[PDB]
C-alpha cells in the first residue's frame, strides 16, 4: 500500500512497442470520451482489478501511509462483475448522474512501457489529465497516473486491460462525483 | 437581525411547510453555526480510528477543525485545532500518532491531552499556560461512535440522543465485541445545503421507493434477468424522535432491495444463521423484529447520518449554505468473519462512494436543487412537506417511539422542527427535553 | 433596504449622473431580482425555438430556471423549473421534445402544461394536486419573440413596450411571413453587470463611432485597405421610449458601416430590392425611412437586446452584480432566400460571438470596468451621463417618440431612470405608464 | 450532424508519419503560443473550413442532437477570408481584447493519423488542453479534440490545413471570450 | 452594524487581547477599505520605477487601481485608473512609457498628468473637461520610496512617519547617492488577511528565532553542517512608533544570522568596510549602532513592509479579508558595486520570492490560520498578544523612541491599536500628531 | 529579454533520439511527482543555470519587455549551490510548506529536439502542465514551456540537465508559493 517511483526499465521499449501502447491509450480515450462504454467494457479481462486508493496528508515521518490499502476503503476497487454493473448504471436511460451525460477529455501522456516475465504482457506507466465538463457550468479537472498491466488482444484496439491502479492527485475530492472512468 | 419571531415562521409542522430560504440564506447559515453547530453533538468517527495512545484524526465540527486524539488513560480528548497565540493550525496532518503537538508559527508546544506545556522565551517576553490552550470541547461515546460539543449548558450525549438509541443499536449493538471501523475516511465536496443530506437519511425512503435509484437497482441483476420486471418494496415504517429531530426508516418483510443492493453473502448474514439471531436477542428488548428489518436509513441531528443495514456512516461538514463535505466510512461487526468483512468493504465502495452506483444519483438531486435556489421566485413560496401528516401513531406493537409509514415526512417535520427551535431559543433552559 | 429615497439618489437623469454603486452593490442586486427581474417582461426566445407540441427550451428569468414549452393548442406556457415538493429540476435537458416531464427525485409526474398529474403513493401519505404545480409565468408574444413576466399586476406586453414597437418592427415586421430563429443558442459568461450590456445596446453608438471597434472594422474591410479609408459615420438619431427605459439608436445614410459588419449581400437585401421595399411599405404607418437606417441597436428593458439589421439578439441573464451569462441567437426573415440566410449566419458568427471580432471588444470594456468597481474610491464619485442633455425633441419629421442625436445618452438616462423608478416604486399603481 | 468515436484505421500509421504529424502540431502550437499569427495563418489553405460547433445537454433519447449542425450558429465557422479578418483583428494595436495579449499554452496529445483517397492528404485526430492566462489573474482552461485534414506542403512546417473541426468540451462557455485560436 | 463602541473592544493594548474577527469580518473589511486605505499613506513603489518623463507603473491603493506616472517637471502624479465617463481602465499595461493615456471605450484622452484633454464629439453632444479627469491622490517621496494618500486632510508624509523615520533610514539613507530598485516587480496571491502579514513585519521576530525558518536556515548553511552545530540569536531590540502603528524589530551583536541569509559577500557589505562606515557617519543624528543591527524587520502602517538587511520590500494589496496580493521588489544602494548588487538579487530570489526558502514558510503560516478563522469557535475567544507588556521605555542609549526586547509583541500592539484608532476617530484633528 | 517561437531545426530529430529525450522527461516527472528530490537533483550538472523569469502584461508595442532580464528579479535564478539549499529545504522535516508534502503531476508534451554545436548535447523545447494539489482542497495549475540544454549521461535516466529556462503562463502568480520544481 505504498507506491514510490515507477521502476522504468533501463533499456527503453523499442519504438514499435512504445507506439502500439500509445495508440492503444489514444483509442481508449476516444471510446471513453465518446461514451462507448460497452466497447470500453469489452477491453477489461476476466481477472481485472481496477483500483484507486485514497491519499491523505501525512507528515514525512508517516509517509509510507499516504495511500489506503487492500483492507481499507477505496474510491474504486473493482472486478469484472462490479465493473459491469457500473457500466450498466452509467448507460441507463434512468441513471440521472449521467443523463444528461458529461463531457470529458482523457489527455494521455508520459507513457512508460515495461516488459514483464510473460511475453505479450506489459507493465505500463502513464500520466493523465481528465477534464470533465457537465450540466451548464461545471468543470472538474483530475490529474494523476495510471499503473496498468496490459495484454495483447484481438480486439480492434490491440490490447486488453488486466490491472489498472490509478493514483489521483487528490486527498479530499474537489468534485461531487466520480461518474467517469479512468 | 433575524428575529426569533421570523425564525419560527420558517417551519410549520402543522400544515407542513418549509421556507425554501432555509437552504440558502447566508444569514441563516451563519446563525446555524452559532446556535446549531456551536451547541450540538457532532459525530467525529469511531473509537477504532484512534486505538493506541497518541493516535489522532483531524476532522471538523461545523467550520472549526478539531483534533480527536487518544489519551494516556485510554480516554479521548477533542479540541479546536487552533493555537490561541495567533491562530495557527496545531495538528497539520489528516491522521497518525503523536507524543507532541508543536505549533510551527512560534514554537508553543502541546501534549496529547491538548494542554499548553511550553512557550519558547517565556520569561524574557512574558500569563498562565494552563489558561491559553486550544479551546477544549466536551467528548462522549455511544456504542463506538465519538461525538463532541462546545457548550457546557447542553444536555449530555445520552440524554440528547433520547429514544433514538433503540434504532442506532440495530447497527452498533449487534455483538458484545462491538463495531469496528474499516480504515480510511472517504471525502468529497457537494454543492448542496446540509439539511437535504440530513433529511434524506432521516425520512427519505421515498427517493428509493420511486425513481432516484432505478439505475442503482438495474446494476445488480444478470443480463438475462432485465429490469422490465421491476419489484418495488411496499411494507415498512418510519421513526420520529420524541425530541431533537432525529429519525429513521426501513422496510419490513422485504429482502428484495437488499439482495440487489448488497449481494447474497451479506443478506444471508444480516438475516440468517447464528450471528443474525444473536443480534435480535441482544436488542429484542424493545420487541424489535430486526431480522426482517432491511434497508434502514437514519440521522442523528444535525449531521450524523448512516444506513444501519448497509453500514456506511458519514458526517456532513457544513461549508456555507451551498456546500458540504461528505466524510464517510464503513462499519463492521468486530468479531465478524473476514469474508463478510471483505463483502462489507467491497460493497460500500461499489455503492456509497463518490462514484458509487447509488451515491451519484443521491448527490445529483441535492446538486440540482441547490442550483435552483439561487432564484428569487424559487425562494418565494413554501415547499411541500405533507407526507403522512398526522398519520403516525403514538405507540406501535413491533417498533417504539412516534412511528409512521416508511414513505412519510414525519421525521423530516421533526428535523426541521428541532432545527427551528435551536435557531429561535437562545436559553438552553427552554430547549432541553 | 436601502430606503426608497436613497435609491432615487443613485440616478439623476436631470443632471445626468450615475452612482457607480448600482453596478457593484450586492444588496441592490438582491433588490433587483425582486423589483426589476421579478416584475419585468423578460425575453425567453422566439416562437420558432418551440414549433411543435411538446418542444421546450430550458432558460431563465433572472436566476430562476424556467421551461418554455409549446402546447396542444399551439399556445406557449412558461413555468419555474422547480418541483414544489423539494425543489428538483423537473426539466434537465436544454431543449427537445417532451411527451411529459417527470421529476427524477421522488417521481412527481407533470404534463407539458406543468400540471402535477401523478404523485406516487398519494393515497398512502396524503393535498390538492392542482395547487402544487410549479409557478407559472405570464406569457406574451410580439411578432415571434417570446417574453415572460411573474407579476399578475404588471402592465401587459403591448403597453409595456409603448412607442418602442415601431423600432422593434424594423427588425420584426418586414415581411408577412415574419422572422424565424436560426438554430443554435450560444452561451457564455462575462464577468460584468447586466446594466452595462443593456445600456450599451440601449443608447451607445458612441463606442462604435470612436475607439471600441477599430479592429473589428479593420477585420471587415478588404485587405488592401486600413482605417485610413474608413469614414467615421456621423449621421443618425436616438430614441428614448415614452415609458419603460427602452431605447434605440441608428445611423441614417451611411451604408458603409453596415457593409463592414454584414458584407455586400446582406447590405443589399436590407437596403435595396423587393424585400427592402416591402419593408418600407409595411412600416409606412411609422413614417420612418426604414431603408436608410443602418447600425441599429436596441434594448427592450431590462435585458432584451438586439441589433436590427445584423439580427443578433440576446438576453443578459444576471448572475450576481459582477456577472451575466449571454444567451444569444439570430433571426432571419423566414422567406429570405437561402443565400441571404446563410450570409446572416456566417456574419453573426464572425462578429457577434464569444470569438466575434466586434463582440470580443464589446465585452472587454464591461469586464475591465467591473474590476475597477471593486475599489472604494472607484465607487465614491458619480459617472458622467450628460451627453445630449436637454437636446432631445418629440416631433421629429422622420422618427417618432423622444428623439435626439445618434451620439447621445438620452436613452441611457431613460434606462437608468426607469430602473430607479422600478426599484423605488413597489406598487404598479404608481409605476404603470 | 452528430460526431461519434474517431474511426481510427486498424493498420496504424507508420512511425515516421506518426512523428511528422506530431512535430507539425508541436510547431503549430509554438507559433500560436508565441503569437506568430501571420506565420500561423500561412498554414491555412484557401479552401479551408474551420468549424467549432456548439454543444448542448441532451437526454440519451436525444443525444444525436448534441452538437449544432451546418446551418446553425457555431463558435467558429470560417473560410480563408473570415479567418483573415480574425488575424487582422488580433494583430491590431487597437484590438483591445488582445492588447495586451494573453499568455496561452496549447498542449497537444493523443495523435491518431489516418489516410485518405488523396495522396499525401491525411485525416488526423488529436486531443488538447489549451490554457489561457490573461490580464492579472484571469485563467481559462479549455479541452477538447480536433479533426483536421492535413496536406503535405512545401512550406516551413511540413503540412497545410485543409479542414479543422474543434469539438470543445463545453456547453455554456466559461470564458468571456474565444480570443484564441485552436 | 459596527458601532464605534464595538470597534474599541476589538483591540486591547493594555491587556494584550485582539478579537479574531478583525481578520475575517466582511463588514469590518468594507470599513477597512474606507477608514484605513481610503486615507492612509500607501507604498506604490520607488522613484526609479518611473525615472523618465511618462514612465508609469500600474499599481494599487487598496482595491483601487492606480497609475503612478513621472511628469516633465520631474515630479510624480498618481491617479485612479478609472475613466469618469463609464469607468473603464485608462492605463492597460503593468508598466512602460506613455506620451498620453486614452480610454479604449469611448476615446476620452488624457495627458500624462491625468488631465482630460479631448472628448470625441464634444461640441455635438456637450461640461468642463477640467472637472472630469480621474481622481488624484496626494504624492509624497521618502528617499526613493513613493507613497500616496487620497485624503487632503491626513497629515503629511514626514509627520505620518514621525519617529519611525530613523529605523527606515538604516536601509534608505546609507549613502548620498541613495537607493535604487532592481528591475522587476514580483507578484503573488496569498489567501490570508493583510493584518497578519503587516503584523509579522512589525513585531514578529519571534517566528524567526523559533520554529518557522528552521528549513530556511538549514538552506543557507554550508553542505558540511546541520542545525545543531550553531545557535539561534537572542540579543536584540524592538521599536514602536510614538504615533502611526509602525514597528521595527532587530537583532544586536549576532552577525551570523545574517550570514545565513544574504551570504558572506553581502554580510561583509552590511557590517564592515568603507560604505558600512559612511553609513553611521551619516546616521549620527540617530545615535544608532547600525553596524551591529542585523535582520531588521519593519512595517510602515498599514501595508508598507521591508527587511533593511535583505532589502526586500513589498506592499500587501488587500483583496478581501480572506486574501492578499504580495507585490514585492528589491532595493540596492545606487553606487554599491556590481557584485554586491548581484548578490542581493540572487539572495532575494533565493529567500524572498514565491518559492524562496524563507518566504514560503512565512506565508504558509498565514494560509492555515485564515483557513481556521472560517469557524465560529475559532473566532469566539480572543488571541494572546501579551508579549513584553510594559517592559518598553522612552529612554534607551543606542536606540531612539519607545524601545523593548526583540522577542516582543509591543510593536504589534501599536499597529493594531492605531488600526483601531483609524477605524473609530473619523476626523484627523483628533488623530494628527 | 523576450523569447519568440522555438527555432526548431528544418530536419527533425531521428525517431530514436526523439524517444530518448521524451522518456527522459517522463522519467524526470516520476522522480519529482514521487518526491525523489535527491535523485532529481543528481540530474543537475556543475554549471546548471535554472531560470524562471517574471512575465508582465505589455502593450504589443512594448512586447520586447514582456519578460524580466538577466539583471532583474525572477521566480527562479539558480546555480548548483542555491538549488542544493532549496533541496535541503524541500526534504527537511521542519520545512512547513512541504511537510505534509504536495501531490503534483508533471504532464509533458510537445517535445522538440535540436542538436547543438557540441555532439551529445541537445537544445530541447517542451510544454508542461504541472498540477499541484495539496492539503485539503488547494489546487494550483501551471502551464508553460521549458527550454533545456541536455547532455548525454552515464546515469539512470540517460541525460543530465545543463540549462533550464521555464516560461510560465502567468503574470501574477495565483499560487501562494512555488514549492514545486519545474
Ligand atoms: S500562533 Fe502558535 S505559536 Fe504563534
Ligand atoms: S422534489 Fe420533485 S419529486 Fe420530490
Ligand atoms: S468609459 Fe472612458 S470614454 Fe467612455
Ligand atoms: Fe438513496
Ligand atoms: Fe459594439
Ligand atoms: Fe520570516
Q: Can you name the CATH architecture of chain A?
A: Roll
| Most residues in contact, chain pair and counts | C-D, 47 and 40 residues
Helix amount of chain B: 25-40%
Order of helices and strands of chain A: HHEEHEEEE
Please identify the top-level CATH class of the largest domain in chain B.
Alpha Beta
Instruction: Provide the domain count of chain B.
Output: 2
CATH class of chain A: Alpha Beta
Radius of gyration of chain A, in angstroms, nearest whole number: 17 Å
User: Helix- and strand-based class of chain A?
Assistant: alpha+beta
Domain count of chain A: the total is 1
Protein name (chains A, D, F): Biphenyl dioxygenase subunit beta
Subunit structure (chains A, D, F): Heterohexamer consisting of three BphA subunits and three BphE subunits. A ferredoxin (BphF) and a ferredoxin reductase (BphG) must be present to obtain activity.
EC number (chains A, D, F): 1.14.12.18
GO molecular function, one term (chains A, D, F): biphenyl 2,3-dioxygenase activity
Tell me what the structure shows.
The complex is a heterohexamer, with three copies of chain A (about 180 residues) and three copies of chain B (about 425 residues). Chain A is α+β, with helices and mostly antiparallel strands. Chain A has three helices and six strands. Chain A has a single domain (about 1-180), classed as Roll (Nuclear Transport Factor 2, Chain: A), CATH 3.10.450.50. A six-stranded mixed beta sheet of chain A has the order 2-1-6-5-4-3. In chain A, a hairpin with a 6-residue loop joins strand 5 (about 140-150) and strand 6. Chain B is of the alpha+beta class. In chain B, helix 6 (about 195-200) packs across helix 14 and helix 9 (about 255-260) crosses helix 10 (about 265-270). Classes of the chains: A alpha+beta (about 180), B alpha+beta (about 425). The interface of C and D includes residues 329, 349, 355 and 364 of C. One fe (ii) ion binds next to helix 7 of chain B. It is classed as oxidoreductase. The entry lists the keywords oxidoreductase, biphenyl, polychlorinated biphenyls.
